[PDB]
């Protein structure tokens, strides 16, 4: 079963390819419609793999240096092995002298195609957490934010270093645990500082006066966080607070850059409004002028965006080069400036949380999900990840789309046609989780093509770890090329990988015109039809859902930005460019469940016909979970039905990291609009009919 194959490979290797069978010829590699690409999840969880405590064993060839993998030919008699990538024959290291065929290395069993090594050579650095807190917000929001950070403090590792930076009109770098005082370094939030200047102006496991071990500082920081008060500067009438977010971040970046560069650190920024002063300003302090919209930016009526986006863009590259993570937690009724600040959590592995207020269960729960621990009590987060990809000599890499930064590492596996963050075989991922999914786009220039994923990152324990996923896919049979190719098509993975390419081009500007010429080209090459007969068009069970995915993608909020705020549009694309396949599908085509007396809950189409008056609906967009009551039900058996979707909702409410917004609406309710807008050129019926007219006519 080709589906059993795709399932188990994602369960084992955390990867999903657009095509599981690759073009064996130059004429088919150039005529590829959906590119050969992979939805790679470097830290995916699974059924208790054994952590390999010995050295990885690498190939002895300067340019290659691939890791010993199940695709390597062994020779237990001669204690040799041939690297499957460069054909180089290798000798076994001394620790492998007792190697035998009845007792072999884990890295050779096909069960351990994806495996994790631990390198224990240098002393382990502590983790670093830098709270960057805005103070220009209402007391109920600030007190709630104070309570959220005091709780996260009680979960950090005792070895972890902590710093505190509060800001409003001025920026305050706190010197922790000073005794009898509790001083702080105050800076103007009006001019920027480099790392060097900041280092000059400011001054066994290491630490600073500003970054200190939790175990020795937690009691003083939990009292400081409890005594934090709003920005003491007054806000005159008709004015926004002077909020220096752009400088407060550049001081949090420069602080760690000149104290602990190239080590896992988390810059957690808490925003209660837009940056109204200094570099990285979003909007002026005049309440008369509203924050910019998608209408304002298209009509050249947003004088702060480009200058503001450019500021945080350099900050993102600074922290990404230094290897530090920038989180952004925004909760305000107006907009916040995520459009201008998106590069910081996007280029690093930073999280981006959005809400109306820090005083909601939405934020409070979402925030403590950041510090979820696994079966040992350690955070599900890794730091400073370096992803290197080894390919066969026939496979080049166009690039990646996802939370990563190019290390600009040159090599024969770099493709001329670069895609996304391309032109490199190594990518830095400052922060990642078991969910972090990259999108690698390959290009081809008996059997088996091979690709190896090597990910060295800093574990939440401080240990240096190396994840090695080695996958192999058959080369297409020459006398059955396109027939074998078509049978391996993963229509779900290809829809997300083609959606990744589109949103990346939109967020870096038509895009729909490209998205259609490829759906049409896929229809003609892999569909069944008589020419000029639209009624004849069918798709295999392998391709039948791809057009429907394209229908819901081209109309999604990821490409139709209007009727959303720019902060919402940047927030939606942020989480899509990071999630795995299954959650990405839920974003583009929300799931719909029906509830009625006439049977147990059942999934239903995302069409207006699914909305019945005597039926309760559950819609699962990734960002929001919605419950709808038809006109009739809007009034022990009535209890089971009314709470049947509520019980189903509570489960998925918890596991999802960015806790989705819950909605309880009914017929006529104002909140029913979210259901009516995801549902239904016009509809799918007209879209499919117009698609068949172009598929059966000229190419």
């Amino acid at each position: 079963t080709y589906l059993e194959f795709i399932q188990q490979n994602e369960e084992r290797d955390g990867v999903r390819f657009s095509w599981n069978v690759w073009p064996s010829s130059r004429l088919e590699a150039t005529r590829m419609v959906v590119p050969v690409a992979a939805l790679f999840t470097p830290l995916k969880e699974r059924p208790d793999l054994p952590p390999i405590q010995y050295e990885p064993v690498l190939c002895s060839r300067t340019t290659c240096r691939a890791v010993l993998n199940p695709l390597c030919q062994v020779d237990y008699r001669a204690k040799l092995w041939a690297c499957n990538f460069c054909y180089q024959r290798n000798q076994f290291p001394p620790s492998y002298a007792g190697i035998s065929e009845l007792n072999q290395p884990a890295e050779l069993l096909p069960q351990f195609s994806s495996i994790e090594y631990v390198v224990l050579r240098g002393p382990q650095m502590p983790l670093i957490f830098l709270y960057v807190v805005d103070t220009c917000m209402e007391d109920e929001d600030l007190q709630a934010l104070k309570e959220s950070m005091q709780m996260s403090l009680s979960l950090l590792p005792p070895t972890a270093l902590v710093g505190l930076i509060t800001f409003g009109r001025m920026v305050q770098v706190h010197e922790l645990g000073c005794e009898g005082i509790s001083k702080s370094y105050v800076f103007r939030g009006t001019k920027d500082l480099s790392a060097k200047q900041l280092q000059e102006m400011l001054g066994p496991p290491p630490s600073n006066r500003f970054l200190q071990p939790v175990q020795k500082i937690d009691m003083n920081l939990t009292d400081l966080l409890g005594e934090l008060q709003r920005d003491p500067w007054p806000v005159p009438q008709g004015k926004r607070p002077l909020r220096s977010s752009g400088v407060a971040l550049s001081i949090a970046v420069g602080l760690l850059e000149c104290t602990f560069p190239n080590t896992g650190a988390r810059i957690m920024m808490f925003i209660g409004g837009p940056a109204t002063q200094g570099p990285g300003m979003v909007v002026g302090d005049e309440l008369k002028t509203p924050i910019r919209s998608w209408h304002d930016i298209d009509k050249d009526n947003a004088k702060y965006v480009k200058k503001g986006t450019k500021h945080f863009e350099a900050l993102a590259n600074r922290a990404a080069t230094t290897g530090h993570v920038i989180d952004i937690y925004a909760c305000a009724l107006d907009q916040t400036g995520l459009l201008e600040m998106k590069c910081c959590p996007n280029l690093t592995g930073g999280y981006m949380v959005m809400g109306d207020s820090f005083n909601t269960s939405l934020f409070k729960q979402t925030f403590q999900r950041v510090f979820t621990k696994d079966m040992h009590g350690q955070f599900k987060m890794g730091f400073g990840g370096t992803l290197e990809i080894k390919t066969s000599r026939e496979i080049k890499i166009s690039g990646a789309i996802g939370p990563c930064v190019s290390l600009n590492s040159k090599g024969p596996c770099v493709s001329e046609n670069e895609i996304g963050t391309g032109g490199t075989c190594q990518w830095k991922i400052c922060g990642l989780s078991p969910t972090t999914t990259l999108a690698i786009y390959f290009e081809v220039v008996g059997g088996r093509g091979a690709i190896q994923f090597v990910t060295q990152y800093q574990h939440s324990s401080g240990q240096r770890r190396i994840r090695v996923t080695t996958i192999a896919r058959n080369w297409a049979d020459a006398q059955t090329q396109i027939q074998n190719i078509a049978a391996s098509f993963d229509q779900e993975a290809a829809a997300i990988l083609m959606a990744r390419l589109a949103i990346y081009r939109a967020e870096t500007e038509d895009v729909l015109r490209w998205l259609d010429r490829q759906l049409i080209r896929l229809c003609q090459k892999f569909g069944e039809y008589h020419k000029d007969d639209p009624s004849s068009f069918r798709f295999s069970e392998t391709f039948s859902l791809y057009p429907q995915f394209m229908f819901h993608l081209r109309r999604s909020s990821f490409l139709q930005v209007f009727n959303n705020s720019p902060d919402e549009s940047s927030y939606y694309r942020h989480h899509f460019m990071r999630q795995d396949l299954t959650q990405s599908l839920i974003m583009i085509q929300p799931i719909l469940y029906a509830y009625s007396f006439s049977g147990p809950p059942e999934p239903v189409l995302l069409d207006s016909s699914s909305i019945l008056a005597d039926r309760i609906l559950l819609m699962d967009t990734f960002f929001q979970i919605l419950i709808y009551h038809g006109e009739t039900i809007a009034q022990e058996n009535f209890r089971h039905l009314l709470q049947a979707p509520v019980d189903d909702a509570q489960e998925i409410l918890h596991s999802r990291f960015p806790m989705p917004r819950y909605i309880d609406t009914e017929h006529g309710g104002s909140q029913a609009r979210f259901l009516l807008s995801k549902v239904n050129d016009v509809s799918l019926q007209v879209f499919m009919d117009h698609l068949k007219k172009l598929a059966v006519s000229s190419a």
Binding site: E138, R230, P234, V235, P236, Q237, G238, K239, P241
Partner: protein
């Protein structure tokens, strides 16, 4: 949306209490004293004067004039609520000694209540007649 508060005895214009903070004050403090001079027993007990980019607001109770200046953008509704809080407190504390004093600023120590009350109005988070000032002068 800034400050200037003067409390004077209407009969002579004798300054009783005031409050000023800069970091000009010289011009509008003159017009303020020109006004205290012209004020008599027939002047409007509540008024508002337009001084270009600035605007005066005063009330009168018990022969005591409570004057405030600010930028014209400041809510006139709030300015009179500010003067009302000053008067009720000032009258409660020094209402019966106003007609006896003869020194200027015989109630400087009212500086305290003026500025702690002033801050509750020059911060949006904390939460009659009109004539151009150049005429009356």
């Amino acid at each position: 949306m800034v400050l200037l508060t003067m409390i004077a005895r209407v009969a002579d214009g004798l300054p009783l209490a005031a409050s000023m903070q800069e970091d000009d004050l010289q011009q509008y403090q003159s017009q303020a004293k020109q006004l205290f001079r012209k004020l008599n027993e027939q002047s409007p007990t509540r008024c508002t004067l337009e001084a270009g980019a600035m605007t005066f607001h005063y009330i009168i109770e018990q022969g005591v004039c409570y004057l405030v200046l600010c930028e014209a953008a400041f809510p006139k509704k709030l300015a009179f609520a500010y003067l009302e809080d000053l008067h009720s407190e000032f009258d409660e504390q020094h209402g019966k000694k106003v007609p006896t004093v003869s020194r200027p600023y015989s109630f400087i120590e009212f500086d305290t209540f003026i500025q702690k009350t002033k801050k509750l109005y020059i911060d949006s988070r904390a939460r009659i007649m009109v004539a151009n000032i150049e005429e009356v002068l």
